[PDB]
Design an enzyme around this catalytic site. Structure first.
Site, short mmCIF file in Angstrom:
data_model
loop_
_atom_site.label_atom_id
_atom_site.label_comp_id
_atom_site.label_asym_id
_atom_site.label_seq_id
_atom_site.Cartn_x
_atom_site.Cartn_y
_atom_site.Cartn_z
NE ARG A 69 2.95 -6.30 13.32
CZ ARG A 69 2.97 -5.09 13.86
NH1 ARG A 69 2.88 -4.92 15.17
NH2 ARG A 69 3.03 -4.02 13.07
CB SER A 122 3.81 2.06 4.09
OG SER A 122 3.79 0.72 4.56
CE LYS A 168 11.34 -2.71 1.82
NZ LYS A 168 11.28 -3.61 3.00
CB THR A 169 8.07 -2.37 -2.98
OG1 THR A 169 7.66 -2.67 -1.64
CG2 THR A 169 7.85 -3.60 -3.85
CG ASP A 210 9.39 -7.60 6.09
OD1 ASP A 210 9.17 -6.38 5.99
OD2 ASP A 210 9.02 -8.30 7.06
MN LIG Z 1 7.76 -6.20 7.86
#
Ligand SMILES: [Mn+2]
Ligand SMILES: *SC[C@@H](O)[C@H](O)CS(=O)(=O)[O-]
Length: 524
Positions: free
Chosen positions: A62, A246, A250-251, A265
């Site tokens: 981004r 990160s 979490k994942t 997400d």
């Molecule tokens: Mn995200």
């Protein structure tokens, strides 16, 4: 129905429109991406996985410095504008400059063949936003077909475009200096007209996060929580939501064969329950391993779209090659994953809210049960680490409103469902190493099954955090982080340090008077 579409596009400024590939099937998109003759970044490449791969040029992530929201009667007093008190990416754009840019993108998309895809952002029947994306590049349409909810044929007959994304990646703006912008590129939003313009950047994420930023504006103003989190549901309908930057795990902790995935997400929480905003997954693939990441790897097949990965002469993909970017990605429709909620990604009300953090300071308890005020305080802090990172509401880059507005609506929904929030440190402690996966899973199990609510509680000083004295299958010697230190002085000095960092970080948010009242819930 195409006539009405061409008219609506004409009203946006597009002229001399040629053929329109409207809501193409995945099979049609595949062929469009690989047809002979494509030039530049429009070109898709066939891989040994049967999945098409594309590149995005200059931008492989981004571009927050190029993000703008138009300053008008709707946004003047409602958007959380960038300011000296608290720097953020919500930079105001004048209506005059917006008009110039909309006309520029409309010109870029004039006189050519276009792809138009309509999908929904939000699985909630009442709060979803109908998104229409217009592009001259087939793979960009594919990205939107993957990432937003794919309407049924019946739904398409009555589809209303609440927001339109005009993707003009091939277009750049040479008037930027005179207009006081950051560069020749732009990712601009006009909330009143319901339009997002993309110029100069081909990064797929701008399309996904643009709408996320818009959901983050509209939903909280209507009392609906908008969250950067994952969510899953158990056999008995019990819903949990997980927040975490990160490296917080979490994942992994959100993955459980006994629980179905609602989403990974972006989610909302309204009067009916928790709902995914998306229809797919946009996953990082650097160093991806079939052994290390079986689920993501298995989803990479026809209809997945690889982005910026290195593809060898034989079509094989070198997932370890970060030459183009370390941020290689793949997007795919959510059904490429097995254990998910179907046929619509949503469920009931959340009763467990988990804030994950990897505390490199080794100060925070493996698990703490938060008061409502602390839930708001730690949500605004978004801490993880020793070098600390503080990302408001675990998603600072997408906050169209002030952090406190997301915190308030989250806690209001929690209060209505009797939900409890927990701060879980999957990071370090006195041992100098991270807590074991056995203990973190045991902690998540105790939160999900409610045993933590039956535990006798103590209180950690400075942070004043309620901590359990025992949990099933969890080592009791780690629950009070002070116990993992031979010299409790090491803990004390680091705790005062970390506490200071939280207190200093919070000042900028106190510019909003509602957030200013939360100082007392933070560390002392
Ligand atoms: Mn995200
Ligand atoms: S950036 C958009 C600009 O390149 C425009 O399409 C050029 S024009 O078609 O010659 O007006």
């Amino acid at each position: 129905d195409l006539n009405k579409l061409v008219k609506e596009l004409n009203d946006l400024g597009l002229t001399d429109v040629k053929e329109i590939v409207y809501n193409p099937s995945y099979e049609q998109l595949f062929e469009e991406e690989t047809k002979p003759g494509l030039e530049g970044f429009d070109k898709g490449t066939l891989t040994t996985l049967g999945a098409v791969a594309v590149d995005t040029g200059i931008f492989t992530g981004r571009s927050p410095k190029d993000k703008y929201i138009v300053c008008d009667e709707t946004t003047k007093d409602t958007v959380w504008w960038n300011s000296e008190a608290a720097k953020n990416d919500n930079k105001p754009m004048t209506q005059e400059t917006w008009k110039s840019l909309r006309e520029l993108v409309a010109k870029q998309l004039s006189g050519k063949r276009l792809f138009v895809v309509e999908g929904y952002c939000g699985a909630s029947e009442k709060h979803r936003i109908g998104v229409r994306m217009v592009t001259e590049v087939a793979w960009q349409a594919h990205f939107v077909k993957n990432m937003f909810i794919r309407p049924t044929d019946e739904e398409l007959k009555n589809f209303k475009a609440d927001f339109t994304v005009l993707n003009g990646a091939k277009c750049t703006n040479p008037n930027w200096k005179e207009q006081g912008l950051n560069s020749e590129n732009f990712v601009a939003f006009n909330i009143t007209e319901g339009i997002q313009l993309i110029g100069g950047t081909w990064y797929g994420g701008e399309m996904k996060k643009g709408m996320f930023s818009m959901m983050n504006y509209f939903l909280p103003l209507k009392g609906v929580a908008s969250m950067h989190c994952s969510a899953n549901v158990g056999k008995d309908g019990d819903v949990a939501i997980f927040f975490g930057l990160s490296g917080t795990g979490k994942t992994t902790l959100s993955t459980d064969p006994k629980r179905q995935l609602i989403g990974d997400d972006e989610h909302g929480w309204d009067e009916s329950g928790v709902f995914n905003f998306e229809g797919g997954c946009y996953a990082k693939t650097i160093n991806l391993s079939q052994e290390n990441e079986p689920d993501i790897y298995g989803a990479i097949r026809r209809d997945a779209l690889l982005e910026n990965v290195v593809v060898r002469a034989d079509g094989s993909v070198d997932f370890d090659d970060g030459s183009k970017t370390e941020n290689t990605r793949v997007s795919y429709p959510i059904y490429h994953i097995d254990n998910i909620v179907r046929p619509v990604s949503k469920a009931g009300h959340a009763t467990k809210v988990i804030f994950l953090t990897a505390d490199a300071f080794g100060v925070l308890p493996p698990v703490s049960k938060l008061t409502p005020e602390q839930t708001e305080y730690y949500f605004l802090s978004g801490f993880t680490a020793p070098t600390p990172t503080f990302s408001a509401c675990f998603g600072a880059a997408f906050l169209s409103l002030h952090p406190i507005q997301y915190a308030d609506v989250l806690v209001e929904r929690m209060k209505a469902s009797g939900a409890e929030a927990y701060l879980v440190n999957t990071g370090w402690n006195g041992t100098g190493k991270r807590i074991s996966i056995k203990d973190t899973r045991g902690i998540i199990d105790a939160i999900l099954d409610g045993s933590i609510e039956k535990a006798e509680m103590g209180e950690l000083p400075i942070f004043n955090l309620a901590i359990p004295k025992a949990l099933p299958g969890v080592d009791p010697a780690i629950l009070d982080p002070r116990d993992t230190y031979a010299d409790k002085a090491q803990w004390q000095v680091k705790a005062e340090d970390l506490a200071n960092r939280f207190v200093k970080n919070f000042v900028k948010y106190t510019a909003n008077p509602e957030a200013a009242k939360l100082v007392g819930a933070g560390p002392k």
